[PDB]
Amino acid sequence: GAEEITADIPNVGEAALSKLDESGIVYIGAEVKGGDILVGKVTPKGETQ
Amino acid sequence: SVTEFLKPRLVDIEQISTTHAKVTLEPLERGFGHTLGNALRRILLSSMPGCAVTEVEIEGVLHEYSTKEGVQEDILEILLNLKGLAVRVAEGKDEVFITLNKSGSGPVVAGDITHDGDVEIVNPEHVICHLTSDNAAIAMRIKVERGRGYVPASARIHERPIGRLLVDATFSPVDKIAYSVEAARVEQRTDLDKLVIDMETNGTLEPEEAIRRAATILAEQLDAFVDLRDV
Amino acid sequence: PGVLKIVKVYLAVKRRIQPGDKMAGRHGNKGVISKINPVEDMPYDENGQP
């Protein structure tokens, strides 16, 4: 499928989505540290055993 | 006698300017001038409390790496200028908010800050920014905190709304300390000495208060030796 | 080809001097900072300037 840029990131709480907007992109002026999400993206994955 | 020493006293305080003073301690026995001078210099240069700007909020500004219309300086340079603000906050308050609103062409200086009477600005001629247009306006909300030492913004423990700008804080008001030990003319003895401490500060801390605070720290740290035991 | 969207983010980092940084003059005198000394521990002149 097509990779989508969005704020709906599985297995990630609301703590890491504070600096993201509705479109899933960080705000301008956001103070960020290591491991913080800048642009949220989800890739479709196949069936996993 | 031999076993009893002469304790120094504060005999003179000379205020050359608002940011420069000389403090004279007399009498001092042989060698004690240098010992006390070095101890007081190391304590004064390292562990003096003060007040510093920590947070700035400027309307329409999201981060330091930007510009504002009608202002010649960048926000980074404005924060650097605010780092040099000499503020005295009344005892009992470790936190205060002051405001700076100014419109029209001209240098925006520290004397244009609105404070609630518990805050004293020591250097009203300190230039914070320049407004280069008649339509230009600036409105900042500055946070001043009491502290000791140097606390960078990164070292502060971690919500913070976007727009609030952290400023590295140098709380110590003491900038330069010198000391000299000269001869003292006391009664008939010639072995006594006189300690002169030259203090260059930002005007926030009084000389006598600084000397007593350094002496208090030294005495409190010496108490452990005065009561030597296994702890 | 195959690219649907690109998002580029620019980060400004303030780097302060620290042990391990390389400092030099204009005469080949290069070196690495070993220690950030307190002001009260540095050599000073008769006027108190370190």
Q: Tokens standing for B34?
A: 């240098």
Q: Contact partners of B by the rule of 3+ C-beta pairs under 8 A?
A: A, C
Residues in chain A within 8 Å Cβ distance of B62? 28-29
For A28, the closest of B62, B159, B160 (CB atoms) is B62
Contact B62/A at CB under 8 A: yes
Question: What is the amino acid identity at position B34?
Answer: H
Contact B162/A at CB under 8 A: yes
Number of neighbours of residue B231 by Cβ within 10 angstroms: 5
Residues in chain C within 8 Å Cβ distance of B200? 48
Distance from CA of A10 to the nearest CA of B (A): 23
Q: Contact partners of C by the rule of 3+ C-beta pairs under 8 A?
A: A, B
Residues in chain C within 8 Å Cβ distance of A39? 7, 9
Residue C37 CA to residue C50 CA, distance in Å, equals 11
b/e string for A18-37 if b means 16 or more Cβ within 10 A? ebbeeebbbeebbeeeeeeb
Helix (H), strand (E) counts: chain A: 0, 2
Interface contact A29-B159, CB threshold 8 A? no
Resolution in A: 2.6
Kindly calculate the radius of gyration of chain C based on its CA atoms and give it in whole angstroms: 21
Contact B164/A at CB under 8 A: no
Q: How was this structure determined?
A: cryo-EM
Residue with structure tokens 């504070």? A18
Which residues of chain B form beta strands (DSSP E)?
9-17, 20-28, 49-58, 87-89, 95-103, 106-109, 113-114, 119-121, 127-131, 137-148, 150-151, 164-166, 169-170, 174-183, 193-201
Interface contact A27-B162, CB threshold 8 A? yes
Q: Tokens standing for B92?
A: 């009992």
Query: Helix or strand or coil: residue B147?
Result: strand
Of B103, B198, B205, B194, the C-alpha closest to B146 is: B205
Query: Helix or strand or coil: residue B24?
Result: strand
End-to-end CA distance of chain C: 62
> How many contacts, defined by CB atoms under 8 Å, are there between A and C?
11
Sign of CA dihedral B212, B217, B220, B224: negative
Residue B73 CA to residue B132 CA, distance in Å, equals 10
Q: Tokens standing for B94?
A: 């470790």
Interface contact B46-C38, CB threshold 8 A? yes
